[PDB]
Symmetry: D2
Subunit: 295 residues, 4 copies
């Protein structure tokens, strides 16, 4: 392995071009993003055989400083004329490879720093403020992009993946976990009605990576919409396990968004122990599941 880069490149832009014209779906009110405030945390990794002597000889001649990579990202956010994190990563990646001919590969992560609307009163009327926003430490959209320079000097996206991270959902009833293996190691009781508490990371890949950019917004899949599909499916499903739940969420996603090729899940079980009905936090060990649904 040989690469290097910069992490935790926070960048906040005001008044990015708004994202409008999205295709709505039944599960979600989402219809675009005002982009009064657009926050992203970027990580950049780069590689190329020509970097070898920066390691083996201490030769910094071909080292773009990681501090300069941070400047590069923040300055490109000031000039970005598009409307999504996905498109912003493509802009940064193409621009970086065009600038630095000795770089052969670039990997980018962008994580949304989300902000929510707040109430303000003007002339007695309460409505969403256009100035004051609330920083959210809950779920957030993500985007990943890998681009390479080929032998013929063409640039090519070899991987692209969008996502929703940090979704923590609890359903108070209508969940069971029964029928699992009972042997010398099994102490868990069957439960026909548990308050299933899952953490979800959900990632999707497009059949056509250009759909991820938002330039034709009707083909863009929004993390907000994915969130609302997950809650809808959770609500309507008498779940039989987390495994069963996440399969059904994935099927619904792929039904609503035929332009997607796959949906990938990382889920964690954080269900409370049962002590009106009162529950409490469990000991630290947590179950998890990882599963891809394909179109």
């Amino acid at each position: 392995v040989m690469y290097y880069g910069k992490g935790d490149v926070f960048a906040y832009r005001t008044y990015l071009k708004p994202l409008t014209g999205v295709r709505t779906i039944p599960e979600s009110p989402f219809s675009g993003r005002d982009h009064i405030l657009f926050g992203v945390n970027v990580k950049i990794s780069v590689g190329g055989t020509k970097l070898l002597t920066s390691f083996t000889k201490g030769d910094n001649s071909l080292v773009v400083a990681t501090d300069s990579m941070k400047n590069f990202i923040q300055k490109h956010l000031a000039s970005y004329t598009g409307t999504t994190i996905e498109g912003f990563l493509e802009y940064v990646a193409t621009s970086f490879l065009k600038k630095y001919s000795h770089i052969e590969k670039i990997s980018l992560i962008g994580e949304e720093i989300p902000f929510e609307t707040t109430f303000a009163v003007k002339n007695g009327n309460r409505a969403a403020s256009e100035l004051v926003f609330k920083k959210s430490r809950n779920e957030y959209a993500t985007a990943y992009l890998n681009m390479v320079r080929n032998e013929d000097n063409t640039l090519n996206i070899t991987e692209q993946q969008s996502g929703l991270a940090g979704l923590q959902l609890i359903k108070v009833s209508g969940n069971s976990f029964v029928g699992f293996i009972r042997d010398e190691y099994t102490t868990l009781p069957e439960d026909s009605n548990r308050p299933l508490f899952v953490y979800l990371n959900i990632k999707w890949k497009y059949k056509n990576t250009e759909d991820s950019f938002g330039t034709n917004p009707e083909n863009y899949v929004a993390a907000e919409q994915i969130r609302d599909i997950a809650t809808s499916v959770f609500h309507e499903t008498e779940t039989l396990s987390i495994q069963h739940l996440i399969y059904l969420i994935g099927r619904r996603i792929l039904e609503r968004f035929p332009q997607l090729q796959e949906v990938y899940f990382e889920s964690q079980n954080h269900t409370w122990d049962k002590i009106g009905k009162v529950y409490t936090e469990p000991r630290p060990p947590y179950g998890f599941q990882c599963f891809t649904v394909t179109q």
Copy 2:
């Protein structure tokens, strides 16, 4: 000092009696709490001169196990018939002192564990779920109560305070910080238009402690309402400092709730450095302010 207790007593109650009958204010849609899911994180501390030999001699005869205090709290959440964290603390405090004659003082903290509603579709109709909720790591309500046993064996609440913790607000424009002292230690440039980013912890005390319990809901002050006052005042104010903002928030709160005696603020400055406009995270050191507005 001599006391002991139990922290991080998480307890989750389903279907607590709903909080209804509250007074609604223009700044906030708040009109009560459904209480399908009621989460609280409780800290209990107890004292009394008869505890002395548990320390000085290793005598456990008068030690209620801290583990038992956890059981006490969780069982009392199961039997609580009221509608507020503040009232639940009074229930626990009175019950504990009635149970254990050798305890002279009990302090309680209750911190809301907040859950937000989610969307679900049924037969082409999208609505709030009554089953699926989203765990929030953003702002949360708080309550504090200290109760003592007097020499005539009556019980007396000696301090009560409610609050809202963890509110993080950024206003993109309409904020200035100018006119401060410039001397050998001053490098901060004056700024007539900064995207002020404040963390707020807001606490209030009632003129009459009974109003905190929710027995008469018309007199209850909800943390949700405090939040929306704070965002509305931030929106409308051309801020001149954080100090200036929190004073005005406090005045508005006391105007809206004449049953309150005081509002106390703990604020922090997390405003980004300026690099379309793009900003980035500052170095770790953070400004802060602490101020009481009284009625």
Copy 3:
């Protein structure tokens, strides 16, 4: 209440004057501090009635910017010629009140950012490096100071406290917790031999505030020494409770340091749950705690 200030003022100084000439105790090999690297995390709070209109009117005329307080602290660590965090706080506090005559009260916290020695081979042998240090996220020393300006413009310290925070100690045997109240709220089994795991914050106050500064280092009480008393007493004692343990630690501290007026404990119980060999695991989140003062 009315005050404001700056938190998380990190400041790393190289080659501070070393702390030597300390007085030893049986429980500790501590003999001083090299101070090749001296890290401290400072919080400053200031007050004064003349700050009122910065809140009530948005008048910044008498506001020292909190950013300037950061500069103030960092610049004073560069000029500090003493040997302790405690003395550094007195230097900052006196300097700040002299500089800003409208400020009536200043409160300072300083938390050590500790670094540990590492090994290097050079010139034929392995020895402690004078250049490479390891950042520790374990226990750390603390200091607290409050100073006021009186009507006549003199300055006075009104509270001083030193401490050791974040000490996490587990003793695998030789601890019991029996004989506690067993009633309708009790499900805890009695345990005659538990692996007691305590978190300890330990804070001490001097009879004479001057002794906290290090100027006469023989009167200084080092957090390293307090750590070593705590581990020794934990080892020595067949404990009967955390309560029992911390009283005994406190008594040993005040016996070893007669210049101390008192020692205050915040302890927490993190003892593991028991499942050929003995195995334990992490408990549920709820944690017991004790707060207790032993006085001279």
Copy 4:
């Protein structure tokens, strides 16, 4: 992708068989591990085509409960008779695949929960306690293992890797970063003498997986020894970059441990910003990093 499992399976064992008979190196005094307290945090992931209907149909007939996996791990730590985390993972993995014939693959991560010695006075002298230990939140050893079941029901290790995580080292002088690209994105000054502060995660792979277990301890590579190589090479080296340093650390590791095939680094730059004495402070959050393998 299809797998499921259990994370944060903390397990603490007392009086595991000690690790001794190790082979020493010049950079390190490491001579073994007492194992009075042996703490590990385990993550287990399992897979197999026969699990499909647990997702597609909600059929749990072939689901080992993740809670049962936690019991499996903890009980196996009680019966483990070996001396390393690496060997513990092999014991768990082999045992789990033998128990559950429908599971085709298991991956395990084991992270050390490290404890440090403390001082106690008893019977006239101060010495290391055999009972009281200090929980450390600094660097820690790691182990990774993947095992598969073949068509003929034999089991094979398919990947093994050991490591040291969380090592945070600052060298106060004797580091430069100069000569890098200065173009329209460059605002970093050249620096001929910086206090380079790196975080290091170092992972190694053996030529022969058996050498990772400790059964013949002379062939085991201890994380403690890797730590001490890293601190020695950092001290010895007038560093020209983090990239330069980690290559030199990796070369030394491979020279000292010919039984290793390769060593892999993840480093992060956390060097302080410079504000009488020299004073530095914490930087803004963005951090540089490097990922690099040195092979034998």
